[PDB]
Amino acid sequence: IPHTHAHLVDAFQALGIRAGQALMLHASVKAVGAVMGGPNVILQALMDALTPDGTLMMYAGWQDIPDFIDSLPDALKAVYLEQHPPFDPATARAVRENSVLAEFLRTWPCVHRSANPEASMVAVGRQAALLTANHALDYGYGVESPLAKLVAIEGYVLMLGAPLDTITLLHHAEYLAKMRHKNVVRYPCPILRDGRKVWVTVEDYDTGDPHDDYSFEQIARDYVAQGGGTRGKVGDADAYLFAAQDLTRFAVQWLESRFG
Amino acid sequence: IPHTHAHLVDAFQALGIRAGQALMLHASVKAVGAVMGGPNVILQALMDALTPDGTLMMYAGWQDIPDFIDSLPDALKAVYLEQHPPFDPATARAVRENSVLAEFLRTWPCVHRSANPEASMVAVGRQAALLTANHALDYGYGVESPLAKLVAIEGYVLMLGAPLDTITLLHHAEYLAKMRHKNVVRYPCPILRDGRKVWVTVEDYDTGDPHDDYSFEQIARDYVAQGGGTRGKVGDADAYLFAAQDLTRFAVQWLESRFGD
Amino acid sequence: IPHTHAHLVDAFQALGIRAGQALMLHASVKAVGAVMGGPNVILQALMDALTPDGTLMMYAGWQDIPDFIDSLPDALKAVYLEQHPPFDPATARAVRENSVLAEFLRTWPCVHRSANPEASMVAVGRQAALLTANHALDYGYGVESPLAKLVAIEGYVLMLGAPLDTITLLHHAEYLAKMRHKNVVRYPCPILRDGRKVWVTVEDYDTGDPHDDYSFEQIARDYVAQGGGTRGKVGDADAYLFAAQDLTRFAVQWLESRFGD
Amino acid sequence: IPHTHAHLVDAFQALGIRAGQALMLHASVKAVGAVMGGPNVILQALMDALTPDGTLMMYAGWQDIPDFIDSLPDALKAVYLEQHPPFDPATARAVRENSVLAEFLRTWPCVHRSANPEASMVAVGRQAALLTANHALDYGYGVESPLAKLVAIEGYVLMLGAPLDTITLLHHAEYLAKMRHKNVVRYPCPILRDGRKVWVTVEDYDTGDPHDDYSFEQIARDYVAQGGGTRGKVGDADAYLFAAQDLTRFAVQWLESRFGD
């Protein structure tokens, strides 16, 4: 029997999902196993556990972001500058490796989407506009980000069969932590400004590689080992539920003690 | 018989105030009528309806801002440049005509205050720091303002016995609207920079008069007439509750249809 | 006896016109008096004094720009939107009040014309393409204007029997000057885009009236009184020759000292 | 015994330097040998050969540009962002490796300086304002640069005992050439905006290393070998005089023939 909407709602509640929470989801559809109605039901069951007074957010990004054009031959780069479409939040597809669930949520009714193309977040619920508002283009995991706001309202992160290395919130901890050196990247990106395409330069800390000798899975496993978070099964998937404030505090101290 | 805290909470909730909302208040204490405990209880009852997870914001400004000194004779202007105190957010009193409630909220525990002297906003609650942060000195009702942020996080405006022409949010609608004519002003203002008094020039759209043949009362009454917002009684006061996003959208379209491209 | 080409060249050189200069001209044909060969000879004599390594520029504008249509009733405005021709730089006639000499220069061999319809400049000579390039539609007397470039390359302004209140360069001084009050306008204009007529909205500082209590004649006469420029006769005309950089610097200071920060 | 002004003027003239030319100089003071009056006389002799109708330009840059701060520990970078002064064209010292002569010319009477900090050019003479005007911050050796204008006005480049690898004009040829790949750099820089320090991001082609398997000395040697330019002695220094137009054309074709796509 495929997992039902009711059984998923109940499993989310048993894990500790409560009405009114703000929750960021990382997921693997395959890890959950067959669901009666497909991945829509995962999202709807989670929303139902949160109720309309809660909020569900996912990292969408932009699957087709042309941030690599400086590596191309000059003639090809010029074609990209002329012909590549800009980031349009109405149509820009979510990064496939962020789970199809992120693309499902991006196209959900009443969804709100943040403006930073590379770091774009999507959310549905009471605080969806708040979480996604005024997402700065530079340092998209920093102070002016949905991650900062998730911490401020004491939200949560749910890992639903997703590897612990994929906790996007830890990029916000990297931003906050006083470390000896962080790598800064500057890359071009087309956006919409006054309804017209404009290429801008985006500045950020490197999010493709760590700034020192560490991994996100290492931080998260250390957090779990010292009693952090709650663990349970949802469908066939191993699930972890973390408080964003405590995990961020732990991760900053973890990074500063080792690399500060 | 003075209105009680409990009855004000009930009246706010009946109007549509809910836990977690971000709310900008315009008020008249006299319109509410006698409250048991005074105007403090109006603020506390509203904060209780919003809960600590909600936010209450008011326009404080600066009662003593010397933005008029260019109109004075040179000798008097010289004294102002030498002797007028700078905007200190810890002490700068709220504009009296913004209601004594704005000054009451400005001095409330855990308050946050925005840095733009003329346009300074004060807020208490979960999003108080967010709303008041990085308030640019130029164009204080524009893109880098608490009003823009209130719209972005889909907050609300509550008129508590206040006239409809006192909706400060409509100055943000003026900023957004593409209009045939706008007045731009530059005026001096003393501020604190690294703990020292410095005189800077602030540039803004004129907020002392409309940019064309309209009034804020016209826009607000037209909004209400077409079903915008909710109306109800709080104490003795007529109250209006507006969604900031919907009101701003309406006002921008209202201005652009009459004076736009 | 009409003034000859040779005598006009000599008069221009005596005034201080030199080979290689970039020169913006304001003129009255009547003030110069009868010229042997007509106004063509005024332009050719000036170009000869400048040599091909110099540049001559005039403000052409567009005599038929329909920037007033927002004031019309909707039915009449609709006809203008459908039927009024767009700004075509090949055919758009210069503003008649800018002197027929501006229209003469607009249709001169090897002329370059800037793209801003209301503020369009025409130029012939070594720096004609440079001066007229990339003239932005918004703020046509501002940073992206031929007037800004004339200042930047330290060109000159020649008043050839033209009243001192017609110095278009002073609109660039207004743009630069930090003043207590500025009027910003938006107006419609049809242009060519990919060979098709398109209506756009242009934003600019108001150039129909000053932004404060001053006149262009007032500024220029003050400049002359303190030793600015050189004066002389060209034909029958009173002539003034100003350095664009020094006049702009003076005018910005003049405006800011009276209406500035 | 030390070289005199009169002999240096003649030596420059013998090379082909003529009245009215626009000339960019690269130099080694040591290569010229002892001059009666010091390096000032090198500059003055060159200006005299060019006459006041000519123009002399050098690449000054900024000796203290902090374009390296991303390589520093984060705590040190924060100090630079707070404490490092901005590029002030009045005081920013020329890059020492650009010759002390560039710093001498930067502080010469009637000098003009372009606004791009890393690529800043200084010039004295009739077209000094033109050459240094509107120098874009991004792609400072490209279309909106003093090198583009030097080509447009048919200027010249003089190597005065300077290595052929130091021909800055060839960075403009790199910009123009359709090459298979060019390296783009983006770096921070403090500048002045409204009299205040502001950190901006500057984008440019890498000028610290070639974009492919070539050197500027290689290009220049090939140019000389096929008859380009003139060569002679000025003091003790080997000198080369190149036409900017022809050298740029040659260098673009050279780069596209070997490294184009």
Ligand SMILES: CC(C)(COP(=O)(O)OP(=O)(O)OC[C@H]1O[C@@H](n2cnc3c(N)ncnc32)[C@H](O)[C@@H]1OP(=O)(O)O)[C@@H](O)C(=O)NCCC(=O)NCCS
């Ligand atoms: C990479 C990762 C997503 C892969 O997990 P996955 O379960 O294999 O992939 P998804 O979650 O996208 O689900 C894919 C399945 O959805 C199924 N599915 C059901 N209905 C579908 C529909 N209408 N359309 C598309 N797919 C559908 C498909 O069967 C698909 O499997 P298939 O394409 O192999 O046939 C996962 O390991 C992971 O890392 N998740 C966390 C990702 C994250 O949050 N990253 C943040 C940035 S580090």
Ligand SMILES: CC(C)(COP(=O)(O)OP(=O)(O)OC[C@H]1O[C@@H](n2cnc3c(N)ncnc32)[C@H](O)[C@@H]1OP(=O)(O)O)[C@@H](O)C(=O)NCCC(=O)NCCS
């Ligand atoms: C102008 C306006 C404030 C006048 O309304 P009001 O009720 O008369 O004035 P206030 O709201 O400031 O309340 C004043 C009353 O508070 C009472 N009060 C109670 N406790 C008080 C205390 N400790 N200290 C001072 N006053 C106190 C006083 O009785 C005072 O009345 P009084 O001074 O005449 O004796 C109102 O009409 C209005 O426009 N409100 C909206 C204002 C706004 O938000 N403007 C935004 C910019 S357009």
Ligand SMILES: CC(C)(COP(=O)(O)OP(=O)(O)OC[C@H]1O[C@@H](n2cnc3c(N)ncnc32)[C@H](O)[C@@H]1OP(=O)(O)O)[C@@H](O)C(=O)NCCC(=O)NCCS
């Ligand atoms: C308004 C102003 C141009 C009037 O001066 P003016 O000498 O009477 O007018 P013009 O310079 O255009 O010369 C007109 C004369 O050129 C003569 N002319 C000679 N050949 C001509 C020809 N082929 N075609 C048309 N006119 C010719 C005509 O006699 C004509 O006079 P007329 O039409 O009355 O018969 C002058 O006072 C002025 O202000 N000049 C500065 C304008 C300016 O630069 N403004 C900038 C924007 S503020």
Ligand SMILES: CC(C)(COP(=O)(O)OP(=O)(O)OC[C@H]1O[C@@H](n2cnc3c(N)ncnc32)[C@H](O)[C@@H]1OP(=O)(O)O)[C@@H](O)C(=O)NCCC(=O)NCCS
């Ligand atoms: C690097 C290079 C400048 C070195 O040449 P150089 O002759 O040794 O150095 P300079 O031209 O700066 O002249 C320095 C000499 O000026 C002399 N001098 C005379 N008066 C002087 C004065 N008031 N102040 C300072 N130096 C003075 C000094 O003797 C000094 O030598 P010293 O400091 O060792 O005692 C030269 O090889 C070169 O490359 N020139 C071209 C540079 C260029 O244009 N680069 C463009 C960017 S690639």
Ligand SMILES: CN[C@@H]1[C@@H](O)[C@@H](O[C@@H]2[C@@H](O)[C@H](O[C@H]3O[C@H]([C@@H](C)NC)CC[C@H]3N)[C@@H](N)C[C@H]2N)OC[C@]1(C)O
């Ligand atoms: C497409 N351009 C990407 C850019 O978007 C950027 O995306 C990173 C993205 O690469 C990064 O994912 C990394 O982390 C994932 C997880 C296993 N942590 C190691 C797997 C993919 C791996 N690249 C995300 N955690 C954060 C996201 N901002 O990374 C650098 C880049 C290659 O230029």
Ligand SMILES: CN[C@@H]1[C@@H](O)[C@@H](O[C@@H]2[C@@H](O)[C@H](O[C@H]3O[C@H]([C@@H](C)NC)CC[C@H]3N)[C@@H](N)C[C@H]2N)OC[C@]1(C)O
């Ligand atoms: C007593 N008659 C009042 C009338 O004065 C009226 O005055 C205030 C009026 O005083 C107030 O104006 C102030 O605000 C203007 C602007 C500069 N605020 C930033 C400039 C004038 C300044 N006095 C308006 N913003 C709001 C308006 N309601 O209020 C209602 C009323 C009952 O009609």
Ligand SMILES: CN[C@@H]1[C@@H](O)[C@@H](O[C@@H]2[C@@H](O)[C@H](O[C@H]3O[C@H]([C@@H](C)NC)CC[C@H]3N)[C@@H](N)C[C@H]2N)OC[C@]1(C)O
């Ligand atoms: C008021 N005195 C008149 C006047 O018409 C005057 O004409 C023009 C005057 O007409 C002209 O203004 C016209 O042009 C303005 C607009 C077309 N751009 C500036 C709007 C007002 C309009 N009258 C001014 N820019 C310059 C002025 N010299 O000439 C002197 C005179 C004939 O005595």
Ligand SMILES: CN[C@@H]1[C@@H](O)[C@@H](O[C@@H]2[C@@H](O)[C@H](O[C@H]3O[C@H]([C@@H](C)NC)CC[C@H]3N)[C@@H](N)C[C@H]2N)OC[C@]1(C)O
């Ligand atoms: C201070 N930052 C510099 C930057 O300004 C920039 O400097 C280059 C500079 O590196 C380059 O000069 C190099 O080539 C010359 C070499 C061939 N000597 C004969 C002079 C010394 C050497 N620095 C100049 N031709 C152009 C100049 N823009 O690039 C390198 C850099 C390290 O990022």
